[PDB]
Design a protein around this ligand. Structure first.
Ligand SMILES: Cc1nc(-c2ccc(Cl)cn2)nc(NC[C@H](NCCCCc2ccccc2)c2ccccc2)c1Cl
Ligand SMILES: [Co+2]
Ligand SMILES: [Co+2]
Ligand SMILES: [Co+2]
Ligand SMILES: [K+]
Length: 304
């Protein structure tokens, strides 16, 4: 394998961390290959679930808790801290909230959250590498509670960053928020990618094509599929009661990705930087409810 940039994996990984048996598990937690029986039963299906009142309540609670856990991660972003230490703190923060960390053993994923530094687009595996000043780093959190998953991500600055970092992170955030702004019943899911790409393209950046936003509730990933690039052919129309994510991955250079021999880590083919943001949204009559918003602060961590 020829690495696309300077980043390398830092092994060995610590033994996987157990989740105490009192915390409710998703079906895949104990499947040997980490397969989700309830997801695979609905594979290849465009049909979007419409959430009941108790579904909505369950989605509200878990996305609130997921935010709390991301805020925990954010507080630890500094030079010399390893992504593995972030993951350990994340893992304990999920347990304290009586939640299962959804990434853990998801299709055998080894860790409790995804940490994506610089050229890693998404799905970075927490490891022994100390964060370096100048780095940007995305932490993507999902929690599982009483049957429901809640999912969000933010990109952070590691100490002081160069001007290109500031710009890429800002634009990425702007892309997310412009797409959230257009969410309301009757809007086509395929339109969000037109908005995202138009904004990224205007700022000299490209949009990753191989990963998408997703529906989420009792399933971690399900219908709808939500591309972040223009002229995509996404199937579906937004409706009051739909719950899904927008999670645009935006690149300094070109849009193309490939995966490390670990089966998970997705990196730019040119080794330039990528940034990402994610909220889980609920479609309402006025627009959408941002289930994963910060409740006690106006902005994402990179601003404050
Ligand atoms: C954004 C995103 N993230 C993930 C993801 C998975 C694991 C971790 Cl640790 C972090 N993120 N998985 C995703 N999708 C997984 C997905 N699975 C959803 C359920 C389908 C069940 C199924 C049936 C047969 C073969 C594969 C999958 C899928 C599988 C194959 C092609 C596209 C998407 C997505 Cl969209
Ligand atoms: Co993912
Ligand atoms: Co996520
Ligand atoms: Co997601
Ligand atoms: K990154």
């Amino acid at each position: 394998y020829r690495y696309t940039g300077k980043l390398r994996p830092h092994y060995p990984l610590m033994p996987t961390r157990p989740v105490p048996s009192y915390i409710q598990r998703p079906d895949y937690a104990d499947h040997p290959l980490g397969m989700s029986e309830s997801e695979q039963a609905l594979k290849g299906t465009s049909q979007i679930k419409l959430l009941s009142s108790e579904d909505i309540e369950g989605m509200r609670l878990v996305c609130r808790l997921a935010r709390e856990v991301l805020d925990v991660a954010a507080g630890m972003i500094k030079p010399g801290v390893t992504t593995e230490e972030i993951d350990h703190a994340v893992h304990l923060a999920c347990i304290a909230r009586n939640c299962y960390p959804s990434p853990l053993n998801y299709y055998n994923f080894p860790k409790s959250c995804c940490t994506s530094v610089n050229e890693v687009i998404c799905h970075g595996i927490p490891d022994r590498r100390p964060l370096q000043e100048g780095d940007i780093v995305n932490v993507d959190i999902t929690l599982y509670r009483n049957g429901y998953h809640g999912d969000l991500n933010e990109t952070f600055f590691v100490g002081e960053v160069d001007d290109g970092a500031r710009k890429l992170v800002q634009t990425t955030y702007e892309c997310l928020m412009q797409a959230i702004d257009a969410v309301k019943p009757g809007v086509r899911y395929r339109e969000l990618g037109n908005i995202i790409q138009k904004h990224a393209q205007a700022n000299g950046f490209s949009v990753v094509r191989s990963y998408c936003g997703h529906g989420i509730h009792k399933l971690f990933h399900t219908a709808p599929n939500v591309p972040h690039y223009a002229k995509n052919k996404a199937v579906g129309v937004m409706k009051s009661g739909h719950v899904f994510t927008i999670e645009p991955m935006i690149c300094e250079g070109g849009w193309q990705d490939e995966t490390w021999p670990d089966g998970w880590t997705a990196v730019t083919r040119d080794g330039k930087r990528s940034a990402q943001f994610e909220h889980t949204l609920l479609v309402t009559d006025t627009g959408c409810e941002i289930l994963t918003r910060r409740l006690d602060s106006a902005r994402p961590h990179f601003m404050s």
